[PDB]
Write an enzyme that holds these catalytic residues in place. Sequence first.
Site, mmCIF file in Angstrom:
data_model
loop_
_atom_site.group_PDB
_atom_site.id
_atom_site.type_symbol
_atom_site.label_atom_id
_atom_site.label_comp_id
_atom_site.label_asym_id
_atom_site.label_seq_id
_atom_site.Cartn_x
_atom_site.Cartn_y
_atom_site.Cartn_z
ATOM 1 N N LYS A 53 70.687 -22.661 33.253
ATOM 2 C CA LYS A 53 71.526 -21.582 32.085
ATOM 3 C C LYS A 53 70.024 -21.230 32.257
ATOM 4 O O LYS A 53 68.571 -22.054 31.966
ATOM 5 C CB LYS A 53 72.174 -22.471 31.164
ATOM 6 C CG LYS A 53 71.184 -23.239 30.072
ATOM 7 C CD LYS A 53 71.673 -24.707 29.505
ATOM 8 C CE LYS A 53 70.616 -25.350 28.776
ATOM 9 N NZ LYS A 53 71.665 -26.698 28.184
ATOM 10 N N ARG B 123 78.796 -28.813 20.209
ATOM 11 C CA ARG B 123 79.442 -27.303 19.736
ATOM 12 C C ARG B 123 80.700 -27.367 20.511
ATOM 13 O O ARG B 123 81.503 -26.454 20.435
ATOM 14 C CB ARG B 123 78.753 -25.911 21.133
ATOM 15 C CG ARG B 123 76.753 -25.902 20.233
ATOM 16 C CD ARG B 123 76.188 -27.305 20.025
ATOM 17 N NE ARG B 123 74.486 -26.794 19.878
ATOM 18 C CZ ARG B 123 73.851 -27.996 18.901
ATOM 19 N NH1 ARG B 123 73.619 -28.350 18.814
ATOM 20 N NH2 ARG B 123 72.877 -26.848 18.611
ATOM 21 N N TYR C 72 44.697 -4.639 18.490
ATOM 22 C CA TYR C 72 45.263 -4.142 17.507
ATOM 23 C C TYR C 72 45.072 -4.995 15.944
ATOM 24 O O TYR C 72 44.215 -6.342 16.154
ATOM 25 C CB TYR C 72 47.225 -4.624 17.842
ATOM 26 C CG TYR C 72 47.868 -3.480 18.593
ATOM 27 C CD1 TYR C 72 47.420 -2.325 18.291
ATOM 28 C CD2 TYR C 72 48.538 -4.225 19.655
ATOM 29 C CE1 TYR C 72 48.224 -0.787 18.966
ATOM 30 C CE2 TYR C 72 48.875 -3.183 20.371
ATOM 31 C CZ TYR C 72 48.912 -1.778 19.968
ATOM 32 O OH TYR C 72 49.851 -0.525 21.019
ATOM 33 N N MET D 124 51.898 -5.548 23.893
ATOM 34 C CA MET D 124 52.877 -6.016 24.852
ATOM 35 C C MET D 124 53.274 -6.537 26.683
ATOM 36 O O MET D 124 53.774 -6.903 26.367
ATOM 37 C CB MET D 124 53.667 -4.817 24.068
ATOM 38 C CG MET D 124 55.302 -4.867 24.878
ATOM 39 S SD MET D 124 56.385 -2.855 24.168
ATOM 40 C CE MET D 124 56.269 -3.396 21.961
HETATM 41 C C1 LIG Z 1 52.504 0.854 23.076
HETATM 42 C C2 LIG Z 1 51.670 2.297 23.244
HETATM 43 C C3 LIG Z 1 52.362 3.677 22.905
HETATM 44 C C4 LIG Z 1 53.462 3.475 21.358
HETATM 45 O O1 LIG Z 1 52.889 3.036 20.613
HETATM 46 P P1 LIG Z 1 53.527 2.227 18.888
HETATM 47 O O2 LIG Z 1 53.524 1.577 17.243
HETATM 48 O O3 LIG Z 1 54.772 1.651 19.272
HETATM 49 O O4 LIG Z 1 54.251 3.540 18.759
HETATM 50 C C5 LIG Z 1 51.248 4.379 22.866
HETATM 51 N N1 LIG Z 1 50.487 4.102 23.399
HETATM 52 C C6 LIG Z 1 49.764 3.534 24.417
HETATM 53 C C7 LIG Z 1 48.697 3.654 25.011
HETATM 54 C C8 LIG Z 1 50.812 1.997 24.298
HETATM 55 O O5 LIG Z 1 49.996 0.985 24.774
HETATM 56 C C1 LIG Z 2 70.937 -27.712 28.854
HETATM 57 C C2 LIG Z 2 72.376 -29.227 29.244
HETATM 58 C C3 LIG Z 2 71.534 -30.182 29.646
HETATM 59 C C4 LIG Z 2 70.697 -30.520 30.177
HETATM 60 O O1 LIG Z 2 69.600 -31.077 28.835
HETATM 61 P P1 LIG Z 2 68.474 -31.361 29.665
HETATM 62 O O2 LIG Z 2 67.218 -31.751 28.120
HETATM 63 O O3 LIG Z 2 67.565 -29.971 29.284
HETATM 64 O O4 LIG Z 2 68.581 -31.690 30.186
HETATM 65 C C5 LIG Z 2 72.630 -31.461 30.188
HETATM 66 N N1 LIG Z 2 74.453 -30.838 29.776
HETATM 67 C C6 LIG Z 2 73.721 -29.671 28.393
HETATM 68 C C7 LIG Z 2 75.355 -29.290 27.674
HETATM 69 C C8 LIG Z 2 73.657 -28.818 28.151
HETATM 70 O O5 LIG Z 2 73.055 -27.231 27.495
#
Ligand SMILES: *Cc1c(COP(=O)(O)O)cnc(C)c1O
Ligand SMILES: *Cc1c(COP(=O)(O)O)cnc(C)c1O
Lengths: 345, 360
Positions: free
Chosen positions: B38, B134, B256, B303
Amino acid sequence: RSTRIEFSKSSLAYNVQYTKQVSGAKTLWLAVKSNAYGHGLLQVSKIARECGVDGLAVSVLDEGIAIRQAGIDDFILILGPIDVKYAPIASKYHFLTTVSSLDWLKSADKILGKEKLSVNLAVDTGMNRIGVRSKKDLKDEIEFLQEHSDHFSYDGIFTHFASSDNPDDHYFQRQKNRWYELIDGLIMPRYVHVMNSGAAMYHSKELPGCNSIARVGTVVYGVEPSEGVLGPIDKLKPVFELKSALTFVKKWIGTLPIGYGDGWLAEYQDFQLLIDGQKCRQVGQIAMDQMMVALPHEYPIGTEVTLIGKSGKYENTLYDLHKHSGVPPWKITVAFSDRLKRMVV
Amino acid sequence: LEAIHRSTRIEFSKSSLAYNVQYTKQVSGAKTLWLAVKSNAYGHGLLQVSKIARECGVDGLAVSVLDEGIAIRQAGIDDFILILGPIDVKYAPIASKYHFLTTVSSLDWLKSADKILGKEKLSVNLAVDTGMNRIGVRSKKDLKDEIEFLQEHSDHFSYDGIFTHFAFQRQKNRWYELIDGLIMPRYVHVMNSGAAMYHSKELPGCNSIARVGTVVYGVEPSEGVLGPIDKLKPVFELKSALTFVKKIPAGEGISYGSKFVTSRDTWIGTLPIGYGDGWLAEYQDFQLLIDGQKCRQVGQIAMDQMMVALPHEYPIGTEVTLIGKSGKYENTLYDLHKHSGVPPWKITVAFSDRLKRMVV
Ligand SMILES: *Cc1c(COP(=O)(O)O)cnc(C)c1O
Ligand SMILES: *Cc1c(COP(=O)(O)O)cnc(C)c1O
């Protein structure tokens, strides 16, 4: 699955016009990096032009290729560096390509063959990420582009601000002064851009000669850059709603298919979800792809749950989720799994 | 959305996965192992892991939703698949066509499915709620009523599985009291990672199947508290390469907010990875491994990019190991948990599809 992000076209359009209004910018380039800040690379890029966006800004080559393969013909800028061996690929797809060195250009000249590359020169004024940091190095690059006009087109020059959204503008002033010193008396191309969200919203008038282009992300996605410290929150419209539906109900506790693996992080524990105009408390822990909520009474399977958005008299905002979790709005949206169902409303 | 032209990659180890499957089977005593795939295989890659699963000794794939099971089938994988979460009843014929062991949690679901299923025999897995689960039935009567419905409507259903999910004592006792005196199917599974590693011999009659995730992905369930970390093999390494290198003087702010300021002439490298790839903000200041040396990741993680302090000049393209081995050192998921507060399974699940994945 019912878990989905519903993107609003009209809200994106509103924020684009508002950004141009406040900044005075005639050209707006939307940053669509990291799956459009989690809003969906392809779906946002598709409606971008209709919403008043003049160009798209991606971080890596592959995000630009994905946009082109989806049939989108819009202007595309690659913000970050790309390996020089991919210069022919960037030229073929007509990307405004960011270059950080003279060495890069020398190696590109050897492989472009019959193709011409659109060049965007990166200037480092304090972000200390990429770009040239001396007037000599910048002049050397401009000269090379002019000496090899058959392989290159000098189309852009830029710098990025590290703190244009900060109430303390000391570093911003240092970067701004450094920018003007570096470009002073040099040949300017068609695109001279520096304005990110913070600069466009709080410092546009302090940037003559470089305030015609807004290279923004955050503000267009309906998030006030300083989150209501330096500017009004109310003048921007939220661009999405995160919804789900009850998959199981027991005698009352409802289960919904969303968890930390989907981007509904463990830090969002106890942030009340909205069901039928009511705030609902969390039951247990947020699992990998499932979580539970306490219901006021019986509800059937398929009952809509609003995680981010409006329901009745209440509203769950990104600002309130930040205050609750310590995770900034742009980091909340980016964390939403690229696997989650995304649609435009 | 996969950034194939970028260096940043998750290198999945097939041999390590096979080792962990064999080790889990040995410790638990389980002869059958079902791998929980999953949430994009806990971030390791749904299709990537599913393709090599059987070759690595996995007997079945456990998914949460219908779409994940369909994705595996459409990739040409014919492995045994079970859906652990509930599906919309209208999709019962789809689940049957794909031969999925389908989880059911109500008698009303079965009654609605009986009306729309034809010649198709749906493989049913009955969910039992033994505490605060759940999904699943909470009473002996409701479980018995489901079992009886399946037995007399065996033209549309096949009673193949029964289960519950653990975290232990109150749940274990409740499990045995709920299933008491009732007809058991061929698959009676309850053992997740914790139960398989620490409670296998406390589960008679229901310890033949290990339905696990965490342990098979090379993470000790309690992170070394209740069991040994050195007996499990890490299933992946996260690597990248320098895209820009420069020498900057003292007084220079990096990234930043200028959260890191240089104290002298320092070599700084730029890496094409950020929080957009799942390398979260809280991982800031983690010491990355470059040429067998610890190099602090300096400044706020952007990012798509982040910076690292280098001991000296390195050329563009120099390999950086974020998670994995380099020289005398090894950055583990436990090291990253101690540094950030984010558990191993939560670290891996956060990796986005932009981060390229490959099998080594
Ligand atoms: C991410 C990015 C932006 C946009 O920045 P914002 O705060 O989300 O407006 C502009 N120029 C560069 C070079 C970026 O990496
Ligand atoms: C995520 C999940 C598992 C596996 O759990 P682990 O601790 O990661 O082994 C088993 N049964 C169900 C129903 C799950 O959602």
